[PDB]
């Protein structure tokens, strides 16, 4: 599939060279929401970034 979401309201597809999706979010800010992209492999998340790949209908 594809990430029927981005950010509060985007909404995207992927291709077909990738597996899932994450939103890219930030933790020393105001926000939760900042981004996401496609993945093709959810290894972990650093303290800096908050990677919430997932592989469901918002994903893959």
């Not at 594809?2 to 926000?31: D, E, I, Q, R």
């Not at 929401?33 to 893959?60: E, F, Q, W």
């Amino acid at each position: 599939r594809k990430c029927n979401k981005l950010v509060p309201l985007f909404y995207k597809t992927c291709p077909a060279g990738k597996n899932l999706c994450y939103k890219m979010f930030m933790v020393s800010n105001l926000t939760v929401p900042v981004k996401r992209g496609c993945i093709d492999v959810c290894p972990k998340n650093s303290a800096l970034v908050k990677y919430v790949c997932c592989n469901t209908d918002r994903c893959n």
